[PDB]
Design a protein around this ligand. Sequence first.
Ligand SMILES: Cc1ncc(COP(=O)(O)O)c(CNCC(=O)O)c1O
Ligand SMILES: Cc1ncc(COP(=O)(O)O)c(CNCC(=O)O)c1O
Lengths: 391, 391
Amino acid sequence: MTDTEVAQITDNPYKADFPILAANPKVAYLDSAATSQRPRVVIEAQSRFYETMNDATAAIEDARASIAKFIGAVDAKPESQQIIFTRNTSEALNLVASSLGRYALKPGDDVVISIMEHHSNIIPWQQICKATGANLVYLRMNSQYQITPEEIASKITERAKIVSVTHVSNVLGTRNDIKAIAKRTHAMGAYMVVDAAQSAPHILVNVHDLDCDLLAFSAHRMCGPMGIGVLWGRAELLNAMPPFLTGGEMAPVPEKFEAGTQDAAGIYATGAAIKYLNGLDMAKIEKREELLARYLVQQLCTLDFVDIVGSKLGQNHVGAVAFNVRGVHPHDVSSILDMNNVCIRAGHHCAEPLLIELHESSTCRASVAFYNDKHDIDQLIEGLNQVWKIF
Amino acid sequence: MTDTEVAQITDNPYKADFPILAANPKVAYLDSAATSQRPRVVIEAQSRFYETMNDATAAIEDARASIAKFIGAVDAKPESQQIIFTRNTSEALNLVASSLGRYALKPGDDVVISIMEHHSNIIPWQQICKATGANLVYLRMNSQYQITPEEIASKITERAKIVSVTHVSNVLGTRNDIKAIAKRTHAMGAYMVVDAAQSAPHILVNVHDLDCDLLAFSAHRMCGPMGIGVLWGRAELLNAMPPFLTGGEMAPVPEKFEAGTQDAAGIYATGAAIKYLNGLDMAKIEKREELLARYLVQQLCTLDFVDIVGSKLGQNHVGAVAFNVRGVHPHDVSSILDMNNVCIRAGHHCAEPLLIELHESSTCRASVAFYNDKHDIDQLIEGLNQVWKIF
Ligand SMILES: Cc1ncc(COP(=O)(O)O)c(CNCC(=O)O)c1O
Ligand SMILES: Cc1ncc(COP(=O)(O)O)c(CNCC(=O)O)c1O
């Protein structure tokens, strides 16, 4: 890293835009992989909705539009009638597993997930597979923590019908080669689902580059409100899949997939959040996070009592870094770190299969967002040192 | 009605507490059966959440607690580990139909809904019935628009396994005799589901009086945020039913039924809304709404060109009054009424089976909340008269 990149990490042009951070300069918040903080604009936008609207229809679709363009889902018109609102990524994944699974799995077909999956991209597929007569096949990692072109070609075969792989691991921070896996999957007559809850808020997503069929994520990782998950699909498939939830207001896509009154004020704020990110220049966002990502792991590697659970190179870490203090249970680490005003995730991160694979029970995790600065990463370091001195 | 009851309807001690109404004295809002307006307290409470918390765990359960006590779900402790959050009433009903339906329907069992049902209490049961080998039986109405003790005993028999009936009709305004239907249903070895989305915000609900097994509703009819539906269940059944959505964070009840990150800021505001209603004195609430209910229908009956689609007695109308101007399509009525700054629902209200039963295609609907006054009901009347003069 250059001396002028530590300069960029050292300045924080963004933290003022967050009330909770603005109110707490003493706090280092290092869990954005869990949920983001909210910009003031997004908090007010949603309060606004409830206080003036409760036209509103014009604004839901402008939100659909804003999200669609943000994920590259264009035509030159944003494909807003092809994005659906759920509660969060888990629900969109449950929906895919139910609807796509009924429409597509014949008995003895193969559904393929990765060992890197979060539980929400595992259990629904297990059910789908029991209900349907289908087998669940996993893609495994190499020494350097990758899904290699050999694993892809060898585990996605002609028996494959659905392939559902995380874009970015909430534990390792690995960016998976989603377009590669897409192309072998189509070859084998199979549908590409991408869990992108942890890629969408950090790197750029373009569904038409990724050439996938279903993409899901949540809004609360990209600065949006809780309560909002989004799914996108190829129109033809959205028209073809059965509906999942049924009732009133469930018809055409998207309405076919949105039963009941929806969180309009939250869909509205989800728009404000997309509009807030594109204003920051989304490229400058991805750039800052990589400098914060690289600075953290470099710093973590000066600490010998610490084991980074993943690639020791930080060019490879998108958003999230998993680690262990040698001999200290992560719950103990997070406690002393909270006494030092630092926020890290501790445990298995609802990715237990991955952690078994790497022969771990628990890990700490630190995760970076654009509204963090070098001092944030220095607090965790100086707090981790307090930890060692005690243990 | 006494001259001192028109006095109570004439004063409005509540409208100031709503920013959207406060900002629009010219507007008469008569669609609270669709969604309520939000109190300022509830708007700020949710903004608050995002700006200070994003302990938070202490507050989700205080919300669970507040809701539980509000529906009488006590022990003397509130049964908060027995209420579950969904997105809205439709999802809770979909969940029941899936989980309870898998756990309980053997082929040739009978599931019984009412003809008064909203679609969200119909279609999931239709699916459940096709998947399971079970028959869907409907409870029908008499001349006076009731589910009589003969209909109950004759359509809920030993073949019955699930009975799911609306507590209050979003079209007729009828309060159904839920405890009666509960008691015949148990007799026949069957589970009592109550769709109470339209009863919970107006009359008192006590799950232990109603002696039911599942109750659902939404928060946005009782002044809470959109995005929040609640389900309650008898603990033993909640422990026994399969989980519906699966993934991460889905285990014990309630967590077994809440997959993924949840709308904590919205669950928080849902608490603020319950806490706002009990402060108003919930009894004084039910009382004011009946005076507004009685005044509307009495007034509507002076208008001859108008047909009230339901009981002409307004002691019987909870919350909602359906009607038609003779010869005018409701969409036309709502348009001229919107030019007169009045808000009514027009159409079939996602209760099409009911409307077929009553030989109607569309109806207008007016619905009253505690924050309405006699002038609100006088605007609709004087606007309906404009309608006739033109048609
Ligand atoms: C890769 C990935 N996929 C799906 C989900 C589920 O998202 P929802 O909560 O919105 O349903 C998560 C959550 N990741 C949780 C964490 O690492 O903190 C995830 O990291
Ligand atoms: C009796 C009843 N049950 C269930 C629902 C579905 O509720 P959700 O939107 O929260 O999912 C409704 C909605 N009633 C809509 C209306 O009359 O305007 C209802 O009136």
